[PDB]
Amino acid sequence: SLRIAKEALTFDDVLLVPAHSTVLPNTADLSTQLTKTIRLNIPMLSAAMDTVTEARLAIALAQEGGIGFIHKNMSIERQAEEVRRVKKHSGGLRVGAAVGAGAGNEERVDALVAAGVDVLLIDSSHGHSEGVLQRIRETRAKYPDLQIIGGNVATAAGARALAEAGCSAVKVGIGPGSICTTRIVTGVGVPQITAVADAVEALEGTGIPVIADGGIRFSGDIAKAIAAGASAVMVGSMLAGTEESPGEIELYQGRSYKSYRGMGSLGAMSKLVPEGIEGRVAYKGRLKEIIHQQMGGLRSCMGLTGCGTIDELRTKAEFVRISGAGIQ
Amino acid sequence: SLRIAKEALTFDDVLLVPAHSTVLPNTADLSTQLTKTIRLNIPMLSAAMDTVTEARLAIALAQEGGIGFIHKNMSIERQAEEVRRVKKHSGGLRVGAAVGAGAGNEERVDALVAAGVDVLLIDSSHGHSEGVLQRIRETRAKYPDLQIIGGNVATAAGARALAEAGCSAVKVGIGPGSICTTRIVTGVGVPQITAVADAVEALEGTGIPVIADGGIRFSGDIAKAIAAGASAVMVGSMLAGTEESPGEIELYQGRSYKSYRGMGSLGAMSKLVPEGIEGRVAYKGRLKEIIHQQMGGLRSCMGLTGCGTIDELRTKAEFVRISGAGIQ
Amino acid sequence: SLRIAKEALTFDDVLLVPAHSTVLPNTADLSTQLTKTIRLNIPMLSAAMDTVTEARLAIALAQEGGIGFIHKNMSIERQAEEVRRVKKHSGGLRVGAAVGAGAGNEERVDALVAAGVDVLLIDSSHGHSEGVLQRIRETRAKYPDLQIIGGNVATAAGARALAEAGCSAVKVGIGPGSICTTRIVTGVGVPQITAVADAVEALEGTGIPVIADGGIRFSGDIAKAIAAGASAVMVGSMLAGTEESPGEIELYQGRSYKSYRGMGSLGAMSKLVPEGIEGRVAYKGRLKEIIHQQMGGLRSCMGLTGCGTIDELRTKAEFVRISGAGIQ
Amino acid sequence: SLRIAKEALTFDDVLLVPAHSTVLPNTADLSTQLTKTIRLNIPMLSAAMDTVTEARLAIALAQEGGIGFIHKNMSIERQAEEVRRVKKHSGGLRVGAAVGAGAGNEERVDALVAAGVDVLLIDSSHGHSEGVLQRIRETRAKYPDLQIIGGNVATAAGARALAEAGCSAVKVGIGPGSICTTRIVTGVGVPQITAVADAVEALEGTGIPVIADGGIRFSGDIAKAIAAGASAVMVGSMLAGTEESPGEIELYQGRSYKSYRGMGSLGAMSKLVPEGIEGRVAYKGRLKEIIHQQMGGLRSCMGLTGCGTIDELRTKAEFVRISGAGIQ
């Protein structure tokens, strides 16, 4: 007899059920509480990846009503500088910045708080690690009002641990990333739809929102992640290759590409075995057109489910479980 | 814990069980009640699509014992004209015409009723939308005897809503269309076999028939949709590319093709994000040969299940659930 | 709610469980009762197909300890002649011959019985059809000692019907054939492993053996069909393309091929829509080498399961159910 | 009704659950008890295959903290010589050697014990065969202290049989090998994750460790096999093509390859039908780099699950069951 805790579902395992609706897709309210104090106009966070979010992308997404997360794969001074560029920009834009859970990050957090960061992201592949929880407790004691997102977890016990450590928001995702090889390398992972619903159920009545991070391929996946209980989603692949993302555009056969790699790739690493792949992603153009298309998809879902707000989608919308023949 | 209402099955998930039979495939009765007043000789409806049904196809299918649905992607006057061409044609052929649920369709319904339409199709991607139900209630009050089909729904609550609004027949199908991207864009959908059986169970004892719309690839799918409880099926892909369908025949490498696109495709649309693809379908030839082949398949099923009539197939025939290995 | 009788399994859904064994693969007894009076040395029957069994193949398989079934796609006189060639051949070989269930087959049965046929196969795509059962009852009354195999069925009720009609053996298989399109055309079919076990359970205590017909791709499938309860298997694809099979060998790119088609293919038919495909199968060489390889596989299974006889394999060997990941 | 003992899971069916952790991947203890008297530094055994383990590979793996198994596809004198080369080498390296269960192996066991073998592997495709169990009982009586591994089994009854016969360790694996065709040829097999957990549950409280043999493709599979209860894993494919493995390196299109075949392949055999394939595997380079990468994967798992030792991973780590959509 094997120690199987439960069956766990991914995005492709389920579909949302259409319901009675007075909701017009164009009248749908996409605003969401990222934390008890931070409200975003769209439920979109950009990944803290060296091929996804630097100041230029963080600015564009904030303009669309989301929030960007400056990656930790640069010097403390260079990151605080990226935070200042987003913060100093006209329009009163909000920004986030990622920090490691390792020793010698107290200095980085200090520089980011001074640079005006709205939300500190304690960025770990294992949020339930005691060293991540200690770092959170240390940051919360020093900065009692700082908005902190901690992750990543994929269990109810993991979400509770982060909430007890002082997290303002909990990030969910162990193995779902499009560039992730954690599942194959370590054998560990939790299918995202179950991971999100478990974390949300654990955090019921706490006012601590859940972020569904990784595995979002289509706008239907955004809707599913929210109906599973996530207040917002974090995307890497969806925003990689856009004009606003870091790095230069490459020309291969005549088609335009941009780099996209996991933060656990050999390339991004330069002592652990890699948990991410390095690849090319087709050039997507301007972030504005991508967000318009993806949010439109979500809007159309809200019309089909009769959910006029993110909160209604999170708590009212129902799913049906489908087979492999259902999927194809 | 996720809000999973139930498991939902598609055509590939099931197979019909052979049973004791005195039914010869050639003696099988294919007639069905589309509504309490309209009886078709074959259980086949053509899709209200701009690449499937105009007067020429509607005439050919009516001649085979089915019914065509003139699409709403043309002016009010041009549609009433298409209705008159089918109606005025010799042989006393029946015709249907699709109308949108939006404002400024009262004028279209008036012109179609005057042009002699036998069945008005209130054509929506979301039949459970309050604005669709209101339009149905408005049409039923003005025309107490007009045959109205409303859709699309995929739940028991959705079928009941349409029946209460005054529908003569309920159309089922949320996401099963061969050209549909609703499932990927919105994340909403119900596998067709479950959607049909739920709607039929809801409408038991009402005399309001269910139309299984979308996803029919083979004649076996027609049989499955009927045994799931549908009185008839609606097909797009199956009749696209036929000589009688609208548009011109294209030559690519030496092979003959015709256009086939969703009514929610960018092309068909010209404010929502697209929910349909634009594609080429191989030229199928004359509609008569397709119907003979597809109905022959259904006839052979009726012989194997011991169901001599559509009503027997709808209520007696049993299924077995199969795995993915069952499918392949 | 859908009328789902049960879940049904195919060969790929299961695996046999290894067990304590005193059985050496080389000492395994492959003999089986085809009927209460006919005992075969190997549990192998060749398909009654115009691309599989004529006198030459029927002779070779009988020599290996199996039995061939001369197909009904030839004149009454020409079939009786094929029966005489196998019967008159030295060695006291047993032969079978297939007859249709249609009117004007009384003459064919008379000629086959006179020609010395050991087993009459009443060959139908639907054994549960009243016209098949009547034909069996008519043959049993006229020939009280004639060995009759009737089929095909795939249910417990279907197996009982054939046994009550007077069948000496029941043939199982609705939709499993490698060249079969019945499932796609009609939507009817029962996954073979469940179909066989249902028929065997129905016929428990009757002494009427079950033949698993269709879908056997590998020697492991033979073992699975027998452990599901079949006393023997019927193969088409496995023996198609052999030197002994009818038709000439074709040369395509340099590789040798032979024709293999369903008896319900357009080609084999020349009033029903086709339920079979027409294809080329690679030349397999001599039947002797194929049987040695396939029976060796079965022998090895008998060693792994601790089943020294066909009867032990049929009644003792256990299965495990596997997922799609189990299969690949 | 089919004799289905249970549902059985393979590596791809499950994922390990992340948990609270004070474990740093670099501080993780990989040591394991292969037997009550033999402790390995890494839980890795090399396959007793003629394309995987001879003295050179056995030396390299022992140096990494594992143990190699010299294959039985060579003369008694030539195998004892291979055992002496590993044993006589500097560093006090441990070695294993495989023997068949057939008659005329008493001579081979005598020569291997004299040559200084640390662990005798009674190597069979069917550990539950009475002739394998007798050979074990004969060896245990003659050598009361000799470390004996017997296999392969895949059931609780099979593991108990080997433990009762006197085995120091039980090897599990019926059909999971990357080069195995037993499942297709015989129809027998047990998905590895269930096979391992069943054998471990059977052997609870006996101090007799289980070896998970076959099917390990990635480092995540090692972790899964251990959490299923295996004390160690046996790998063929993972070490085939390495510089230390037997045979010469071949050049095909410009890429370097090495031979990899099942011990039941036609080639390795030269009276049974083959149960293995013959193939080329890409040249992997030095064994040291492969082990560093694979153990790193395991180390990372130990950090994610909060299991600081092999024993903790074997008994504390939990799984989630995933769908086919979960897998892809």
Ligand SMILES: C[C@H](Nc1ccc2ncc(CO)cc2c1)C(=O)Nc1ccc(Cl)c(N(C)C)c1
């Ligand atoms: C190589 C890998 N790289 C990454 C980097 C970013 C990631 N971001 C998200 C996820 C989600 O599965 C995994 C990630 C893996 C990684 O950090 N492994 C890893 C494995 C086990 C432990 Cl205990 C730790 N402790 C927390 C430092 C790290």
Ligand SMILES: C[C@H](Nc1ccc2ncc(CO)cc2c1)C(=O)Nc1ccc(Cl)c(N(C)C)c1
């Ligand atoms: C773009 C799309 N296009 C279509 C067009 C024809 C269709 N026909 C059938 C189906 C069935 O899923 C979907 C279809 C989508 C479409 O209408 N989306 C859509 C999504 C949500 C709502 Cl609330 C509405 N309200 C009813 C106007 C429309």
Ligand SMILES: C[C@H](Nc1ccc2ncc(CO)cc2c1)C(=O)Nc1ccc(Cl)c(N(C)C)c1
């Ligand atoms: C076209 C087809 N052809 C065949 C021919 C050989 C077959 N042999 C076996 C099987 C097993 O599914 C199907 C076969 C279909 C065929 O006979 N259909 C078919 C379908 C329904 C009925 Cl009621 C009948 N009645 C018995 C004459 C025949």
Ligand SMILES: C[C@H](Nc1ccc2ncc(CO)cc2c1)C(=O)Nc1ccc(Cl)c(N(C)C)c1
């Ligand atoms: C041809 C085959 N070859 C091998 C060789 C190595 C293997 N090693 C492991 C496994 C695990 O399924 C299968 C293997 C098959 C093989 O031994 N078959 C086989 C089948 C049934 C029995 Cl009763 C026996 N008795 C034990 C001698 C052998």
Ligand SMILES: O=c1[nH]cnc2c1ncn2[C@@H]1O[C@H](COP(=O)(O)O)[C@@H](O)[C@H]1O
């Ligand atoms: O190398 C890596 N391994 C595993 N997960 C990663 C890696 N790098 C980033 N991630 C995660 O993958 C997410 C992006 O997933 P995507 O949106 O599916 O591409 C990020 O937000 C991280 O949570």
Ligand SMILES: O=c1[nH]cnc2c1ncn2[C@@H]1O[C@H](COP(=O)(O)O)[C@@H](O)[C@H]1O
């Ligand atoms: O763009 C679209 N999106 C979704 N469904 C569509 C679209 N256009 C038409 N449909 C549906 O798809 C059906 C045709 O499906 P088919 O027979 O599987 O090709 C139509 O009768 C409509 O119900």
Ligand SMILES: O=c1[nH]cnc2c1ncn2[C@@H]1O[C@H](COP(=O)(O)O)[C@@H](O)[C@H]1O
């Ligand atoms: O056209 C056909 N349709 C369906 N089944 C067929 C047809 N012709 C033969 N069969 C069946 O298929 C079996 C051969 O299956 P195979 O061994 O999997 O190739 C025959 O013994 C018949 O029972």
Ligand SMILES: O=c1[nH]cnc2c1ncn2[C@@H]1O[C@H](COP(=O)(O)O)[C@@H](O)[C@H]1O
């Ligand atoms: O021909 C064969 N048939 C079946 N299993 C085999 C054969 N040769 C070796 N094996 C098994 O396959 C294992 C290697 O599996 P791998 O690590 O998945 O490649 C060996 O340790 C044996 O247990």
